[PDB]
Symmetry: D2
């Protein structure tokens, strides 16, 4: 029974029908909601903006303001959760994703499937015009004691100085009920910052996340 | 000047039935707080008064480092307009248009609010809404005269189930926003609201706070 | 107690916070769902693509396969309906509209408020690059006996060859319940074709509409 | 070749719980008709079988003047992939990915379907759906290898209230679509479906008709 210290990821799928596959590993601090990840392609250069991957690059590192997050609680007792995520982009592209995890003590192993379609060949993803993912606020609600619905209006900056917007929605489905200290505090917001460096084949990702019910 | 007092005429219809109210209130533009009391001019409201909350004054919202663009546009008299849509989970929709005139530190609002498709057995027409959940709005500036604001909103209900909606608006400015405002995006706003009501009268309070970050600088120690 | 033959329109509102106002008159045929309208601006050149007005340019002209549409039925008995429409455009613009009607025999008077915002100044609406409204299919459902919910995915062709897409949603709210034989046939689809010619100050509009529950029978 | 027969392996999960079905069918690619029989490989389904309807073969769809792009992509073997999202009014969502391979006039489908957020007391998890309403899909071709299709879908339910969803998908082709396809936009498709189910199998039929016009 542990909170995480290290993780590894196998992420795979396709963009516009062309497969991709990466593997890597990282660390984080589950008291602080910080994480680091290094990935490498197993199949040559990426054929799309690496910034498209940012949401897909570990809420087990997210504490809540007064104790473990439900994500942490489900790792700590092994019962776990699954993530089912949809992203609709303003130019008509769509991404669906499914995150599965296994745990070995303080080590997480993720297997993530990400499928993207409808990215215009001349758009900012396929022509590498994204420059950074804006800071975000996610809203979480708990429609039942095993399900979190999370929503965020997301945006990237681009080289043309126009933002590239999307709507992100997801269910987090838990094998066991969430705790009562969790379920009674709604809505729960989470502020996130991300940083990405990249080459054609390798990515270096960091995330900082903080849960909040109030800013006043 | 910055505002101290305001009044509102809010009118339109819900499910094709007209409504009309007039109200007066006050606010603190340094702190993002406001209060408003209204009375119906046409008898008891036939829908949950909670449905009116977002429609019951960003001139009271300061920004983190100075006047909000809303405040600046009142201060120089150029002004802005609000065009908002709300789509509810049970298929209802509300559209709203907010116009303002100013007389020194006094705001006068004229708001048209039109709602349709509220199920006769749903929580709006059966008065099951109990409170508006605290919210975070995201703002972006697609061009120098236009703010796009989005929020995922929810009410608690007597059934213990939330009643969710998607709120979207454009704020259209007659003159460009200041360059220093446009340079910091996204801007978020956290809001809290309280409503007391009868069939014909209501008391509204709101607290709003703009923020770009919730994390510490990290240079303590 | 009549079905329509003639109509007039006052349409007004704003686009990107700038007012507009138009008036005109037309005719149509309630047997076949055809209509024609001519409009003129009362305040000089329109500052936006006149194609953006198309959906706002008369379902009283729409018959149903075997009898009156609910729209026809509500004009015929004077009880009436109101329209509340939202249109969300792919580039983040939004239009809301409210249609109200009064009737004098076979003549309809429309007063339409249309408010649009968030059109990018460099986009196809504000730079007049829309070239045609694609033919459309609207889906109608009747969630209660006085309310129609209609939805359509709409698109314009543009001078750049890429389509300019939107999502159109409306409620039509009736003073009296719709007839049982209307309510029993759902969903009800409507196929529409439109044609527009325009200048900076004037336009001529035509629509053809046809209701259908099936294309296989 | 145009298809005569098909088989399906459909798998994934609903509210975190795995399902897996296999089955086979036939169809008429000149008329746009198909039928399929399916069985669970691991026990009775824990959700309304009607939720599977969209996931239960556009190779059987002709176009008004010739092959659909789907048919043409089978005929030359180059193929297409489907990536579909469905957002339901009560907050549930389904994502799906369909892959196909071929031998002669036979199609083999491999479909991954993942559904989450279905309320435990809702019409899917308590089996209150009664039928899929007839639908109209709008198709556009943003580029010569990509179809975007949209539909506003609804089921009837035991109590009369429709259960509504928004269906969106991309169909991604390995080779350009034919220029005579690409010229006719939008292309609409009317569909009808029929589902019967036991505890031991389901039987599915679909009829589909492409049109540019009804007038």
């Amino acid at each position: 029974a542990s909170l995480p210290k290290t993780h590894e990821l196998h992420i795979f799928g396709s963009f516009n029908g062309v497969k991709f596959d990466m593997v890597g590993e990282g660390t984080g601090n589950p008291n602080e909601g910080s994480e680091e990840l290094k990935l490498k392609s197993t199949n040559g250069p990426l054929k799309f903006s690496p910034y498209i991957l940012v949401p897909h690059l570990f809420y087990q590192y997210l504490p809540f303001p007064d104790g473990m997050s439900p994500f942490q609680a489900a790792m700590h007792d092994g019962s776990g959760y699954q993530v089912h995520r949809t992203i609709q982009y303003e130019d008509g592209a769509s991404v669906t994703a499914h995150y599965r995890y296994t745990y070995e003590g303080s080590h997480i192993k993720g297997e993530f499937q990400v499928i993207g379609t409808g990215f215009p060949p001349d758009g900012p993803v396929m022509t590498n015009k994204l420059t950074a993912m804006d800071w975000s606020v996610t809203k979480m609600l708990y429609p039942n004691d095993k399900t979190i619905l999370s929503t965020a209006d997301c945006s990237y900056t681009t080289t043309a100085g126009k933002r590239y917007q999307s709507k992100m929605r997801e269910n987090n489905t838990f094998a066991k009920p969430m705790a009562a200290d969790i379920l009674q505090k709604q809505p729960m917001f989470v502020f996130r910052k991300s940083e990405l460096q990249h080459s054609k084949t390798e990515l270096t990702f960091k995330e900082w996340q903080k849960a909040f019910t109030d800013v006043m």
